[PDB]
């Protein structure tokens, strides 16, 4: 049975709290070298959404990584959240990623919510040479965005990275999530030779959110999502921020399948577009380029979508990675399909397979209206 | 005390229901002026939301203004949904009033909620000639748009009835909300002088949706909303069809005020844009200018918004009516306040009400962004 009371001692929350929780959101399974792990899908206390705790030799809390705040402005925002100075990363577009090395020696990959994933596992340690640093330093862990075109979750194609890679951009203390600050990771990252996000610079506060401005503008005519502002010690939590390219690639993506997004989800996207309007632009053709881009990213993805479906295809995404075997494949298929993703794999060949995955409801209501369905 | 055996007999909703539902709402008022009346906010069994029930001499259920479907398509829609024959008659961008003669004498005309409007009982008087046809028919209601620039709830310049008009489009038998047939209906009006809404024509439904398609261009091309589809019998419920022009004037207006409709407000009216495009746009040419009147719609007035509450404005809206006189002017604000709109009387010259709504909830959000609050 469940220790809840050994679980109270590490983390904080009552044992009778956490038998509240597991009511609903506190999960016990069967995960690595077999142990047994308790994954929070709910924040709870001072615990993240996705927070696990591995009952092992000695038991092993690797938190959630937390929220990260959005702000729609520059100024006066970031002035009035930092001091001093300010430490600027690029965001990249991908999945969220905790890599610990576990009590037995196990390595562990694990996604936002806490589950740990075949393919990612894999894959980290095929990209990322990690003996040596966990050797030295095997209570931190290893907060990373996965990138790449051939990625099953958020294909976004990062040249420099190749089909599939790995950029860190946090180390954290296991139970305690206690963040290294901005300099002293990026510089202990370098010597075990692991690869760190994109830093644009660290800037005097009062400069920052001019050099932001510039840094988006950058990356908003390269396609890249946009920012992420760090407190170089860590001692004020991150901002994050995005660039007008961004919103328009992710609301596309979104009238592609509009009924499979949560409804808004969309007004929050338009809504950065008003406030970036009123600061970044400066002149009126660039505001008559944004409403341009924003009306084409909404109407043209729907219109084809629907065009699409007309002509009989169902709504659906397929990505193409690198697999073991075809049981690992399929075995990555039973974690998406548990996660509430509809997918079935529809191609394999060598270690390469196609993952399909299906959006009913755009199908099903699309369908149905153009049958002579009532809105 | 409330005669609920009464109503239950008047209405066939079981007392049961309506004590529950009074317990919440469903309203008990004083109107017209000695009688006592029953206001039901939400629908009830048959009751529609807006019925209002008069305990006079004669117990009198105006039975409320049924919601219309809306349809985002003319084919196969339309043939799917009536029979024989559709009579397409102009969606007029107003507000909905029944104008009803009580069994007391007393002439009342009701906004969609249910309330006697006192400026509509008043402008709907010197507008129509009502005494006739009301001596001869005291038991029909007179379902109208009251529309035009110099509205007191949504302004819309329309041509034909200068700053403010007033078109039937239903005649509706008090207690059953039986509505007339189409031709009968408009005939009838006719005779007593009373002004139809536009009919375009009564087509047969293999040629229906061709027709709308034609009538639609033409309203979009002049402005005009859409239209009002209607089996001729009214054996089938009607359906309601929008044009582009009318969704972008519905966002851009929306975008001004983002916090305070939606989210949307927003999806709902884009999605309508996307089967609109699919199913009426001839050429690559029209989409792509739907798409830039979609993102101006959306970009500008947020701007716009943005900037004028950074320069210290509140946001609000003003419209300017025709009015008896300041008092009248003083009464119609009493109203708004008591129906809990936050309204002013901002201005009055020689029969002129500058009539000023706030919106807190888009100053107050704005401003908080604007202060440096987070996300
Ligand atoms: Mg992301
Ligand atoms: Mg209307």
Same mark, same amino acid.
């Given at each position: 049975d469940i220790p809840f009371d050994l679980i109270q001692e590490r983390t904080g929350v009552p044992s009778s709290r956490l038998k509240v929780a597991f009511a609903r959101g506190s999960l016990r399974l069967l995960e690595s070298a077999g142990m047994q792990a308790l994954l929070f899908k709910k924040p709870l206390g001072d615990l993240e959404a996705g927070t696990v705790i591995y009952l092992g030799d000695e038991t092993e809390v690797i938190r959630g990584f937390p929220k990260i705040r959005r702000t729609l402005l520059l100024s006066p925002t970031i002035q009035e959240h930092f001091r001093d100075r300010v430490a600027v990363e690029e965001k990249m577009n991908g999945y969220n990623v905790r890599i610990a090395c576990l009590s037995s020696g196990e390595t562990v990959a694990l996604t936002r919510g806490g589950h740990v994933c075949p393919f990612t596992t894999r894959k980290a340690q095929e990209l990322l040479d990690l003996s040596e640093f966990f050797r030295e330093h095997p209570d931190l862990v290893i907060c990373g965005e996965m990138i790449? /075109? &051939?990625?099953?979750?958020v294909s976004q194609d990062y040249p420099e990275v190749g089909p599939l890679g790995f950029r860190v951009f946090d180390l954290r203390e296991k139970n305690t999530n206690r963040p290294l600050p901005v300099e002293e990771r990026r510089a202990l990252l370098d010597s075990y030779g692991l690869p760190n996000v994109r830093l644009f610079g660290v800037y005097p506060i009062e400069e920052a959110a001019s050099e932001v401005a510039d840094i988006i503008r950058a990356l908003g005519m390269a396609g890249r999502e946009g920012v992420v502002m760090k407190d170089p010690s860590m001692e004020v939590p991150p901002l994050k921020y995005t660039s007008s390219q961004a919103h328009a690639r992710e609301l596309a993506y979104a009238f592609s399948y509009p @009924? &499979? @997004?949560? /409804?808004p989800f969309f007004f929050s996207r338009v809504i950065r577009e008003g406030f970036q309007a009123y600061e970044l632009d400066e002149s009126d053709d660039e505001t008559r380029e944004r409403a341009r881009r924003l009306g084409e990213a909404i109407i043209y993805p729907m219109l084809e979508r629907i065009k699409s479906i007309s002509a009989g295809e169902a709504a659906y995404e397929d990505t193409v990675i690198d697999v073991e075997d075809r049981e690992a494949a399929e075995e990555f298929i039973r974690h998406l399909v548990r996660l509430g993703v509809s997918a079935t794999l529809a191609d394999y060949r060598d270690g390469r397979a196609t993952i399909r995955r299906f959006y009913q409801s755009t199908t099903d209501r699309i369908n149905n209206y153009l049958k002579g369905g009532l809105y």
């Amino acid at each position: 049975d469940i220790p809840f009371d050994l679980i109270q001692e590490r983390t904080g929350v009552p044992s009778s709290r956490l038998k509240v929780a597991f009511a609903r959101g506190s999960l016990r399974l069967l995960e690595s070298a077999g142990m047994q792990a308790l994954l929070f899908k709910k924040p709870l206390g001072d615990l993240e959404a996705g927070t696990v705790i591995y009952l092992g030799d000695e038991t092993e809390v690797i938190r959630g990584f937390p929220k990260i705040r959005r702000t729609l402005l520059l100024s006066p925002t970031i002035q009035e959240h930092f001091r001093d100075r300010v430490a600027v990363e690029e965001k990249m577009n991908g999945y969220n990623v905790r890599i610990a090395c576990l009590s037995s020696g196990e390595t562990v990959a694990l996604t936002r919510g806490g589950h740990v994933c075949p393919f990612t596992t894999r894959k980290a340690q095929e990209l990322l040479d990690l003996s040596e640093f966990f050797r030295e330093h095997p209570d931190l862990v290893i907060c990373g965005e996965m990138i790449g /075109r &051939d990625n099953p979750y958020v294909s976004q194609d990062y040249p420099e990275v190749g089909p599939l890679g790995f950029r860190v951009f946090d180390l954290r203390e296991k139970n305690t999530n206690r963040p290294l600050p901005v300099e002293e990771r990026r510089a202990l990252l370098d010597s075990y030779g692991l690869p760190n996000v994109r830093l644009f610079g660290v800037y005097p506060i009062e400069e920052a959110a001019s050099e932001v401005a510039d840094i988006i503008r950058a990356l908003g005519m390269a396609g890249r999502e946009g920012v992420v502002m760090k407190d170089p010690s860590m001692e004020v939590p991150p901002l994050k921020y995005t660039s007008s390219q961004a919103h328009a690639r992710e609301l596309a993506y979104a009238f592609s399948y509009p @009924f &499979d @997004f949560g /409804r808004p989800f969309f007004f929050s996207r338009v809504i950065r577009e008003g406030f970036q309007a009123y600061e970044l632009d400066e002149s009126d053709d660039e505001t008559r380029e944004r409403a341009r881009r924003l009306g084409e990213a909404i109407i043209y993805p729907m219109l084809e979508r629907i065009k699409s479906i007309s002509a009989g295809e169902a709504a659906y995404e397929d990505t193409v990675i690198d697999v073991e075997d075809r049981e690992a494949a399929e075995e990555f298929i039973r974690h998406l399909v548990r996660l509430g993703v509809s997918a079935t794999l529809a191609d394999y060949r060598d270690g390469r397979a196609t993952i399909r995955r299906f959006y009913q409801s755009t199908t099903d209501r699309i369908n149905n209206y153009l049958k002579g369905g009532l809105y």
